[PDB]
Design a protein around this ligand. Structure first.
Ligand code: MG
Lengths: 377, 13, 712
């Protein structure tokens, strides 16, 4: 009886713009999975002078003492801090946020890039959905419980560059010894600052949680800081014409990541073989579509195709008939989403399934205190 | 093709 | 007179630092503060060191000096108006006047105020011998804090600022700060504290361009010590002052680009093979330390380091030999590493004897190529003969009149006090004064071979309060200039019954050093005992008039003036359209909205929104009535959250580099000429940030790949 539907991944819509991103709030996540709503202890500040690029800074240094906390988390992809942040913005104004879909920027990017990247290259994942009066979308974790250590070292390299280029407090409030210790400092992952952004495409209104690296120039208290953030990005050599094309495909995915949530600056480090930081370069998020149209037309073309697909995708998430029954005490429904063989597939999770009793009755998708917030109107 | 992605003004609520 | 030897050293060693000022010469009364600056690029900020223009106006090189204090103020307005037409600050102007100085300088000011008061008697005797009858010269000891004349300049400045902010539409968002003589600290120190506090705001623009006007040579080292690379210094042309061998209306001026001096120092300060990483911001701090160690306001020179220019070149050759043996640079954010300074001075002590031989041989060549006491001129050097063996004992026994058994106990104390002084002077310029009370107790320095046994020393200071203006005046004036004080204090200076007569000797011995055939000797005045001076002076206060207790308060407020500005509504609403008839509440503001930061409160001088402003001078100027056009307020710096760091800030974009590879190589390898008064006009250099990115193109980068391909 219930919903089953498929969307063809190379079909595209008509939307070519996003509603201007605005910051609802923020939270920081501790290494202990505690969520600190309206708290910014994990927001870093950028600092890396041009003179530092003359020094042969090594991005492999300290790999053996890496604190990867994120592996040990009980619910790696949990919505809890996003929902708990939304509730705090609703409590002081007495009404729901008018939005249709609540999700992470990472899930929005993983969807949109299906239009271009095949399931293996994309690293396709299960996505899982429910309604309450709006759609809530969650990623299913990787199930893990250029090869082996040489892939883990290329992952670590990104977290070390983000640790070398930043400070935990403003430069003006940081003592000189903390700047000198910075090359010896332990690198860690799963200790984020997450901004909560309101946005939209066509007629769809969206709330995206977005993990941000640092603030580039300055912080304004009690205001949208969205124009002050930057993304610092993972690093590679460029020494030949075909290296420019390998870079341009990474720069497109990086523009897509910033554009969805209004981050205006992208900063790239570059490496030799081995792990010496060779150079740094910086891009405004507005340059990238023009820069790609000039240097590589068939990649620069994808910037419009991505948004024409993002609108089609989000309209068909609402038009593939999940119930949007508004009364927050009416019975819920619950669905899978996949990408498989140029189709995206969606199916209800009927009450016989092991998931169905737990996403409907229990903690696995929406927090009990959030269900009480909204059922108390 | 001169068209490129841009933002639009929100609903003001 | 010829070019000063310091400027001959700059034009020889660093020729591309210097470039001409450009002027528009419009002849109409020039409206155009608002047109594009001809002398390249715009200034955001300008700082005026005001004593650098009060002195040229009142004692000019022109045969007529101004004949009244009213005409002196009128000349200062004409000169500052010419300075702003060259410099055109878009965002802020600071007018800093010398206030009460630390004890470290008061004992050096006292010498010059006593010395010039004796020169005034010698000329008044020459005028009396000719005798326009009774036409005495105006006493230049009047230009100090707390006098009737500075109290007059304080009103003239605040009026002339209002006239410009009311009448000129170019000033419609310029912010003017006035740090008058009633606010303590010298102008040079006030300006550094301002720049340092603005730079500590997170909202600060890393690319604000800056300028200091002033005639002092130390401004170059203070420009470097800011670590603002977008910096230029404005000065009168000392090379035209030679080539003139006919009025101030056509006197030319110079820019000195600190932006390009850093570019020279990048090659000059390079040392290969260091154990720690080379870092130009710390190398420049050590070089600025050497420039203040061997030429200074607060300490006497080492006997070895007689001329500052070739002395810097000697200390740098020692630092280049010592540095690869050290653990670190010698300075850090204004703090010394005494272990490393002890090794630098031990190396100088090993050269000192041969420096003395070569100086005496050179003076013998200068000669043949051409061919203590109770009072009067004399000379201690003629007995010492530093160029002949055993001078160490002969120096101390002649200078201090000390028997040879006590020389060790004396040497240990001078080296302690001199190193505490070197530590005080470095802290003064890098973080603001550590004590207002500290001073060096002696007329002379140790020899360089004396500098050992202080590596262990721990240096500490207290910010005691600066003196009140009459305590300052008593502490630096001779009895001859007593007319600048209230009548009551003149008795303490001059009656033989006074508890403090011994501080005011009518004549004192002057010791010519180095056989200097000039004015250059040391005046051996007695050092004031300040607890004994203050208890005498403060006993008079209950006999002052209330009009004389004013002029003797601290100007704890600096003052800010604005005019329909970007902050004018916010300031006017909180400060003046008040909740209650008090002065309780205060406004803190940040760099982004207008280009200035600070803390602001209602003015204490009695300003109000519908009042009248009227000038204090008889030059024919408008009573502006313009409290409707203008706001003025008491102003205060935001105090530093942490110690200031010698680093470049995030987002600094450099200018175009000026030096070619041969300019760098000829500096690295000392490759020794310009007809510099003419050849200087070939220099022009760009100002402000070039491009929009913080980093150079380097191979192995996406945007750099196309850059080097197109450049091929
Ligand atoms: Mg990043």
């Amino acid at each position: 009886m219930g919903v089953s539907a498929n969307l063809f991944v190379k079909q595209r819509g008509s939307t070519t713009a996003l509603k201007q991103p605005k910051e609802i709030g923020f939270y920081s996540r501790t290494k202990d999975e505690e969520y600190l709503i309206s708290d910014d202890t994990n927001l870093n500040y950028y600092y890396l002078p041009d003179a530092e690029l003359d020094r042969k800074l090594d991005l492999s240094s300290g790999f053996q003492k890496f604190k990867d906390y994120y592996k040990d988390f009980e619910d790696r992809c949990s919505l809890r801090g996003l929902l708990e942040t939304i509730e705090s913005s609703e409590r002081h104004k007495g009404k729901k946020i008018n939005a249709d879909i609540i999700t992470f920027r990472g899930i929005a990017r993983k969807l949109i890039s299906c239009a271009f990247d095949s399931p293996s290259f994309n690293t396709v994942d299960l996505r899982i959905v429910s309604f309450n009066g709006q759609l809530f979308i969650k990623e299913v974790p990787e199930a893990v419980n250029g090869r082996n250590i040489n892939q883990d070292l290329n992952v670590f390299t990104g977290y070390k560059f983000e640790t070398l280029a930043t400070l935990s407090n403003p430069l003006q409030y940081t003592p000189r010894e903390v700047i000198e210790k910075r090359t010896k400092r332990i690198v860690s992952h799963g200790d984020e600052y997450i901004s909560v952004v309101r946005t939209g495409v066509g007629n769809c209104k969206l709330i995206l949680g977005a993990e941000v690296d640092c603030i580039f120039d300055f912080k304004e208290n009690g205001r949208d800081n969205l124009k002050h953030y930057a993304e610092l990005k993972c690093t590679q050599q460029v020494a030949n014409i075909s290296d420019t094309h390998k870079f341009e495909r990474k720069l497109f995915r990086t523009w897509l990541q910033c554009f969805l949530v209004g981050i205006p600056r992208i900063i790239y480090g570059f490496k030799d073989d081995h792990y010496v930081l060779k150079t740094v370069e910086e891009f405004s998020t507005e340059e990238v579509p023009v820069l790609l149209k000039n240097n590589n037309p068939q990649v620069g073309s994808a910037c419009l195709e991505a948004i024409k697909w993002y609108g089609l995708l989000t309209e068909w998430l609402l038009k593939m008939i999940p119930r949007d029954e508004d009364p927050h005490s009416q019975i819920r429904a619950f669905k899978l989403v996949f990408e498989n063989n140029h189709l995206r597939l969606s199916e209800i999770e009927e009450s016989d399934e092991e998931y169905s009793g737990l996403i409907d009755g229990e903690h696995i998708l929406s927090n009990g205190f959030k269900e009480w917030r909204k059922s108390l109107k | 093709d001169n068209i490129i992605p841009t933002y639009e003004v929100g609903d003001g609520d | 007179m010829g070019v000063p030897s310091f400027f001959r050293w700059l034009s020889r060693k660093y020729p591309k630092i210097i470039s001409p000022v450009l002027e528009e010469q419009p002849q109409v009364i020039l409206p155009l503060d608002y047109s594009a600056s001809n002398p390249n690029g715009e200034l955001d900020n300008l700082y005026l060191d005001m004593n650098g223009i009060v002195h040229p106006c009142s004692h000019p090189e022109n045969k007529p000096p101004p004949e009244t204090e009213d005409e002196m103020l009128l000349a200062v307005f004409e000169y500052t108006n010419r300075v702003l037409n060259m410099a055109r600050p878009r965002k802020v102007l600071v007018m800093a006047v010398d206030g009460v100085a630390p004890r470290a300088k008061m004992n050096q000011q006292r010498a010059r105020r006593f010395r010039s008061a004796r020169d005034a008697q010698i000329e008044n005797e020459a005028r009396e011998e000719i005798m326009v009858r009774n036409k005495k010269t105006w006493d230049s000891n009047a230009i100090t804090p707390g006098t009737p004349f500075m109290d007059k300049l304080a009103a003239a400045l605040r009026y002339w600022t209002a006239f410009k902010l009311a009448t000129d539409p170019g000033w419609k968002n310029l912010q003017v700060i006035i740090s008058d003589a009633t606010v303590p600290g010298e102008g040079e120190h006030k300006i550094m504290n301002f720049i340092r506090s603005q730079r500590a705001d997170p909202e600060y623009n890393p690319n604000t361009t800056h300028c200091i006007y002033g005639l002092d040579a130390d401004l170059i080292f203070l420009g470097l010590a800011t670590h603002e690379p977008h910096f230029k210094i404005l000065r009168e042309d000392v090379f035209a002052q030679d080539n003139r061998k006919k009025q101030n209306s056509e006197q030319p001026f110079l820019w000195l680009h600190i932006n390009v001096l850093r570019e020279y120092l990048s090659a000059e300060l390079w040392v290969p093979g260091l154990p720690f990483t080379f870092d130009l911001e710390r190398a420049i701090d050590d070089w600025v330390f050497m420039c203040f160690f061997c030429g200074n306001d607060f300490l006497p020179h080492l006997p070895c380091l007689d001329v500052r220019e070739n002395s810097i070149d000697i200390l740098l050759d020692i630092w280049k030999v010592v540095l690869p043996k050290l653990k670190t640079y010698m300075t850090c954010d204004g703090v010394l590493n005494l272990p490393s300074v002890e090794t630098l001075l031990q190396h100088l002590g090993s050269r000192e004897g041969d420096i003395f031989k070569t100086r005496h041989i050179q003076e013998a060549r200068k000669k043949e190529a051409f061919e203590g006491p109770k009072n009067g001129v004399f000379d201690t050097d003629e007995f010492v003969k530093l160029f002949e063996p055993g001078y160490h004992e002969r120096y101390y026994t002649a200078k201090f009149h000390v028997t040879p058994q006590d020389i060790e106990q004396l040497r240990k104390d001078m080296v302690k006090c001199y190193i505490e002084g070197v530590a005080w002077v470095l802290m003064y310029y890098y973080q603001g004064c550590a004590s207002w009370n500290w001073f060096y107790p002696y007329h002379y320095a140790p020899l360089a071979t004396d500098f050992h046994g202080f590596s262990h020393l721990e240096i500490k200071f207290e910010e005691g309060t600066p003196f009140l203006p009459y305590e300052q005046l008593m502490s630096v004036l001779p009895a001859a200039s007593g007319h600048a004080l209230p009548k009551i204090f003149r008795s303490l200076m001059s009656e033989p019954d006074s508890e403090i007569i011994d501080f005011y000797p009518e004549e004192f011995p002057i010791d010519m050093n180095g056989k200097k055939m000039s004015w250059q000797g040391i005046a051996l005045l007695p050092f004031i005992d300040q607890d004994r001076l203050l208890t005498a002076v403060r006993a008079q206060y209950p006999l002052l008039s209330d009009a004389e207790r004013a002029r003797n308060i601290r100007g704890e407020p600096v003052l800010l003036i604005s005019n329909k500005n970007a902050n004018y509504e916010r300031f006017s609403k909180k400060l003046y359209s008040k909740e209650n008839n008090n002065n309780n509440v205060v406004v803190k503001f940040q760099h982004f909205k207008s280009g200035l930061s600070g803390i602001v409160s209602k003015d204490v001088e009695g300003f109000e929104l519908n009042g009248k402003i009227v000038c204090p001078i008889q030059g024919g100027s408008l009573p502006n009535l313009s409290t409707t056009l203008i706001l003025k307020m008491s102003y205060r710096l935001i105090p530093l959250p942490s110690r200031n760091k010698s680093i470049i800030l995030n987002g600094f974009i450099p200018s175009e580099p000026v030096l070619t590879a041969y300019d760098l190589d000829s500096i690295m390898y000392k490759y020794n000429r310009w007809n510099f008064g003419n050849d200087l006009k070939q220099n022009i250099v760009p100002v402000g940030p070039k491009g929009i990115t913080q980093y150079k193109p380097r191979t192995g980068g996406y945007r750099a790949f196309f850059y080097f391909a197109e450049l091929s």
